[PDB]
């Protein structure tokens, strides 16, 4: 559970957090998350413990230790917690509210309050962390990607397309390109003027990708930063390659049948360390595992009785 170099975990509306293994897919162990569902997971950056962003409450369960219920409980967020992040050292958690407020939460010291806030207009969907640990990128349900400097308290708003809820965002570990993805079915790539010592932090609009027909839901770069995976609500996970922005691979969990009235959407994905295998979650109980070259379903982690929304996938030593 902690010992395996590929920690994979997964959850959704079934109230359980199941821990799979990469090679085989024998379920190692499971943990309860009652009273609620799980909006998104993340593992802490030293593989120590794992987060479950519920309704009204984050909780955190031990990954190293064998069979616990939660170590830490944070409440004090009076709607959903729609994302998480973590300081790569492991002191802070950078959350996002349904209540328009992207907080910060100290992990080491017990304090039920948040250290800082960043209030905006609409509910906060994505809370992704730029690699140098100084900028935090917050999107919302009115087009607005606010870039919030954690040192200088600056907040520069940015509307790619008018009004459309930008549903998720991520920035690569290179700090070369950022991609956020909206409900229209478009994946907007932003060229980084990499604000290291200056805080230039300017973005130059590269390309609108006609990514998907229906809602694009989660986009992510691989640790290589060669590949930009964009899950969606056309039960698809279209991988885009960095140089062209051309369709390198198209994963799909469609029926192959004239009558199949929505099997379930392709919610969230997460690359391997080598970026040869791409996991994905779906709203038909199936956390899968693919081959990024071809598009071949290398495993299938079917244990949930109801749906699955979020992953937690981990390569690191």
Q: How far is the CB of 9 from another protein (least distance, A)?
A: 19
Distance in angstroms (rounded) separating the CA atoms of residues 52 and 19: 13
Counting contacts by CB under 8 A, is residue 217 touching another protein? yes
Distance in angstroms (rounded) separating the CA atoms of residues 204 and 281: 32
Counting contacts by CB under 8 A, is residue 141 touching another protein? yes
Q: Which of 91, 142, 92, 99 is nearest to 118 (CA)?
A: 99
What SS3 class is residue 170?
A: strand
Q: Calculate the alpha carbon distances from 292 to 39, 106, 252, 278 in Å.
A: 26, 37, 12, 6
Q: Which of 170, 217, 174 is nearest to 189 (CA)?
A: 170
Counting contacts by CB under 8 A, is residue 309 touching another protein? yes
Residue 124 in tokens:
């906060």
Which H or E element spans position 309?
strand 308-314
30 vs 165 by CB, closer to another protein: 165
Counting contacts by CB under 8 A, is residue 285 touching another protein? no
Distance in angstroms (rounded) separating the CA atoms of residues 223 and 303: 28
Q: Site residues for another protein, window 39-98 (CB under 8 A)?
A: 39, 55-56, 80, 82, 98
Q: How far is the CB of 239 from another protein (least distance, A)?
A: 21
Distance in angstroms (rounded) separating the CA atoms of residues 209 and 108: 41
Residue with structure tokens 């920690």?
Answer: 7
Member of 10, 16, 183, 184 binding another protein (CB under 8 A) = 183
Counting contacts by CB under 8 A, is residue 37 touching another protein? yes
Task: Calculate ∠ Cα 216-172-223, nearest 5°.
Answer: 105
125 vs 186 by CB, closer to another protein: 125
Counting contacts by CB under 8 A, is residue 36 touching another protein? yes
242 vs 282 by CB, closer to another protein: 282
Member of 125, 242, 272, 314 binding another protein (CB under 8 A) = 125
Instruction: Pick the piece of the chain touching another protein (CB under 8 A) from 86-94, 107-115, 188-196, 257-265.
Output: 257-265
Counting contacts by CB under 8 A, is residue 123 touching another protein? yes
DSSP string, 284-303: SSEEEE--TTT----EEEE-
Instruction: Pick the piece of the chain touching another protein (CB under 8 A) from 33-41, 112-120, 173-181, 199-207.
Output: 33-41
Determine the size of the site formed for another protein (CB under 8 A).
27
Member of 173, 262, 300, 316 binding another protein (CB under 8 A) = 262
Q: Which of 69, 70, 102 is nearest to 83 (CA)?
A: 102
Counting contacts by CB under 8 A, is residue 13 touching another protein? yes
Counting contacts by CB under 8 A, is residue 186 touching another protein? no
Q: Interface residues with another protein (CB under 8 A)? A: 13, 15, 36-37, 39, 55-56, 80, 82, 98, 123, 125, 141, 165, 167, 183, 215, 217, 233, 261-262, 264-265, 283, 306-307, 309
């Amino acid at each position: 559970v902690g010992s395996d170099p590929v920690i994979l975990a997964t959850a959704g509306y079934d109230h359980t957090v199941r821990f799979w293994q990469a090679h085989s897919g024998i379920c190692t162990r499971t943990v309860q998350h009652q009273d609620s569902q799980v909006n998104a997971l993340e593992v802490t950056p030293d593989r120590s413990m794992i987060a479950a962003a519920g309704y009204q409450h984050i909780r955190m369960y031990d990954l190293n230790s064998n069979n616990p219920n939660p170590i830490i409980s944070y409440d004090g967020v009076n709607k959903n917690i729609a994302s998480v992040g973590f300081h790569e050292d492991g002191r802070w958690m950078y959350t996002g509210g349904e209540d328009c407020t992207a907080r910060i939460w100290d992990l080491r010291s017990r304090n039920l309050q948040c250290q800082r806030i960043f209030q905006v207009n609409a509910p906060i969907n994505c809370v992704c962390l730029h690699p140098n640990q100084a900028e935090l990128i917050v999107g919302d349900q009115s087009g607005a990607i606010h870039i919030w400097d954690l040192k200088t308290d600056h907040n520069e708003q940015l509307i790619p397309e008018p009004e459309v809820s930008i549903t998720s965002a991520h920035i690569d570990p290179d700090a070369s390109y950022m991609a956020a993805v909206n409900s229209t079915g478009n994946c907007y790539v932003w060229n980084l003027t990499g604000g290291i010592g200056d805080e230039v932090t300017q973005l130059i609009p590269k390309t609108k990708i006609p990514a998907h027909t229906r809602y694009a839901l989660q986009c992510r770069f691989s640790p290589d930063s060669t590949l930009l995976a964009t899950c969606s609500a056309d039960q698809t996970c279209k991988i885009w390659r960095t140089s062209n922005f051309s369709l390198m691979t198209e994963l799909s969990i469609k029926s192959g049948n004239p009558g199949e009235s929505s099997r379930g959407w392709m919610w969230g994905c997460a690359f391997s360390g080598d970026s040869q295998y791409i996991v994905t979650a779906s709203s038909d109980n199936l956390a899968r595992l693919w081959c990024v070259e071809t598009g071949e379903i290398k495993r299938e982690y079917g244990g949930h009785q109801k749906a699955v929304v979020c992953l937690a996938f981990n390569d690191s030593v």
